[PDB]
A paper describes a structure:
The E.coli Fic protein EcFicT forms a tight complex with its cognate antitoxin EcFicA. EcFicT adopts the conserved Fic fold, but with a distinct active site signature motif and an additional hydrophobic binding pocket in the vicinity of the active site loop. EcFicA forms two parallel α-helices that tightly embrace EcFicT.
Strikingly, mutation of the putative inhibitory glutamate residue E28 (EcFicAE28G) decreases the melting temperature of the complex by 10°C compared to the wild-type complex. The peaks of the first derivative of the melting curve of EcFicTAE28G and EcFicTG55RAE28G appear to broaden towards lower temperature, indicating that the E28G mutation may weaken the complex stability, resulting in a partial dissociation of EcFicAE28G from EcFicT. EcFicTAE28G crystallized in the space group C2 with three complexes per asymmetric unit. The structure of this mutant is virtually identical to that of EcFicTG55RA, except for disorder of residues 83–86 at the tip of the flap. In particular, the interactions formed between the Fic protein and the antitoxin are the same, giving confidence that they are physiological and also occur in solution. The Ramachandran angles of R55 (Φ, Ψ = -120.7, -160.4) are virtually the same as those of the G55 wild-type residue (Φ, Ψ = -133.6, -155.8 as measured in the EcFicTAE28G structure). Though the side-chain truncation in EcFicAE28G increases the size of the putative substrate binding site, it may not be sufficient to allow productive substrate binding and relieve the inhibition of EcFicT. Because of the hydrophobic pocket on the left-hand side of the active site that may accommodate a different substrate, de-binding of EcFicA or more drastic mutations may be required to allow ligand binding.
Residue numbers in the entry:
A (entry chain B): 5 to 53
B (entry chain A): 10 to 82, 88 to 195
Amino acid sequence: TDKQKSRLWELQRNRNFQASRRLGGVEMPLVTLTAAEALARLEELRSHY
Amino acid sequence: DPYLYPGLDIMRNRLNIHQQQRLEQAAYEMTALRAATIELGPLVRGLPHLRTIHRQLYQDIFDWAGQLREVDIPFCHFAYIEKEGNALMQDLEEEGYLVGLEKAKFVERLAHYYCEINVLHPFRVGSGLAQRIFFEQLAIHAGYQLSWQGIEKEAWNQANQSGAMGDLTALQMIFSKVVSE
């Protein structure tokens, strides 16, 4: 169940974050990226500001 | 308000952005991508873990990410947040993190713990976000899962407003739709 729990987390967490943010009134795109892809994108966004 | 830059009405931030619209955009984008790297975390979880979640979300935007609110800006006076948050979390521990509950009891206790942490308002910014991640994760450790998909902004607020006043009925109704499996 501990690997079953982690995999369920990974598959829902971004969908959640989008809908949690929409609770506070803001529509952002869904993040479809994997963790490592999102980490690379963070360093790109830091360069841009 | 020590969170602001000296001259301005903008929050001091690590990107040194001095325009309101831009800071909001970059904060939405960077938080979104940080959330996509947050891992489930431990069953045994308290104030430290909530803080850990908020550090991960906001580390690119704020030097104080992961620290408890230091001004008053109903919500707990800032200097008592740690005391009452640890007290709250010790109680969650005593109920084994809500693990092993039938749906209706789970919904009833989740509503209670959500309402109490929310009123505590432990972070200067980003409390609701860090909070809902903590309970998404707690729910999964207890055999359940949360989805915020159908929920209108205005109902969510009203239901939290009456919950802070001692009537958990509207937050309970919302949670019986948000909880499943």
